[PDB]
Amino acid sequence: PSPLMGGFGLKNPPPQILIKNTPVPANPPAEFSATKFASFITQYSTGQVSVEIEWELQKENSKRWNPEVQYTSNYAKSANVDFTVDNNGLYTEPRPIGTRYLTRPL
Amino acid sequence: PSPLMGGFGLKNPPPQILIKNTPVPANPPAEFSATKFASFITQYSTGQVSVEIEWELQKENSKRWNPEVQYTSNYAKSANVDFTVDNNGLYTEPRPIGTRYLTRPL
């Protein structure tokens, strides 16, 4: 049961955190009406969210002699730096980065 | 006092270990001669030498966002692997590798 998109398949994954604004009704009528409220005060909310994950690592223990393939930035004069913002303030990721760079014997 | 070829300048560097074969004279004459010996038994020596160095490291503490430049092996079909032996058994080093790959603010 490993997900086909990649990642960790969990029987009990991190649960969903669900959030909503509590409805605030607008001015009710002077006389009672059993029809459910449809007029609400229009509002939104803003805030800060923090997520902290501890990850366990499994270190390489290789006896390989020659140097390994590593993920590296390209050294060259470029109009922009990779994984940065442009002059308009837009953060971009130039390429997808995988994980499989170190090697081990089969 | 930093050496101009690069490295650590030490006032008391690792001392020189000097080794030689003790001369073994050949057959001396029957009568005494005060002339110093010039005929020796021809010999050499072989053995194993071990050197163990402990090095202190100074870890990066960078807050840089984009990925760093790393020294990497080239991924490509090549007749040989870098820093290995060839079919004749000769170990070769394709290029000189420096140290300055990570960065820090000035």
Chains A–B, number of C-beta pairs less than 8 Å apart:
45
Distance from CA of B98 to the nearest CA of A (A): 13
Among A66, A75, A97, beta carbon nearest to B69: A75
**Measured between CB atoms, which of B66, B69, B72 is closest to A84?**
B66
> Is the CB of residue A86 less than 8 Å away from at least one CB of chain B?
no
Record the tokens describing residue A43, joined without a space. 């509002």
Degrees to nearest 5, angle at CA A47 with A43 and A53: 140
Is A47 annotated as ligand-binding? no
Interface touch A83/B69, C-beta < 8 Å: no
Residue with the two structure tokens 């960790």? A8
Which residues of chain A does B76 touch, with a Cβ-Cβ cutoff of 8 Å? Answer: none
> Given CB atoms, is B81 within the 8 Å cutoff of chain A?
yes
What technique determined this structure? Answer: cryo-EM
* Token code pair at residue B12: 């008391």
**Can you tell me which residue has the tokens 């050949």?**
B26
The dihedral built from the CA positions of residue A26, A30, A34 and A35, taken in this order, carries a sign that is: negative
Q: For residue B65, which residues of chain A lie inside 8 Å, CB to CB?
A: 83-84
Can you tell me the distance from the alpha carbon of A75 to that of B100, in angstroms, rounded to the nearest whole number?
13
- The data reach a resolution, in angstroms, of 2.3
Which residue is closest to B73 within chain A, CA to CA?
A69
Distance CA B82, CA B67 (A): 25
Cβ atoms of residues A57 and A71 within 8 Å? no
Provide DSSP, chain A: ---TTSS---SS-PPPP---PPP-B-PPPSS---SPP--B-------------------------SPPP------S--SS-TTSB-TT--B---S---S--S----
- The per-residue DSSP string of B17-83 comes to P---PPP-B-PPPSS---SPP--B-------------------------SPPP------S--SS-TT
Query: Using CA atoms, how far apart are residues A87 and A89, in angstroms rounded to an integer?
Result: 6
| CA-closest candidate to residue A45, choices A25, A23, A20, A16 | A20
Do A52 and A91 contact (CB within 8 A), yes or no? no
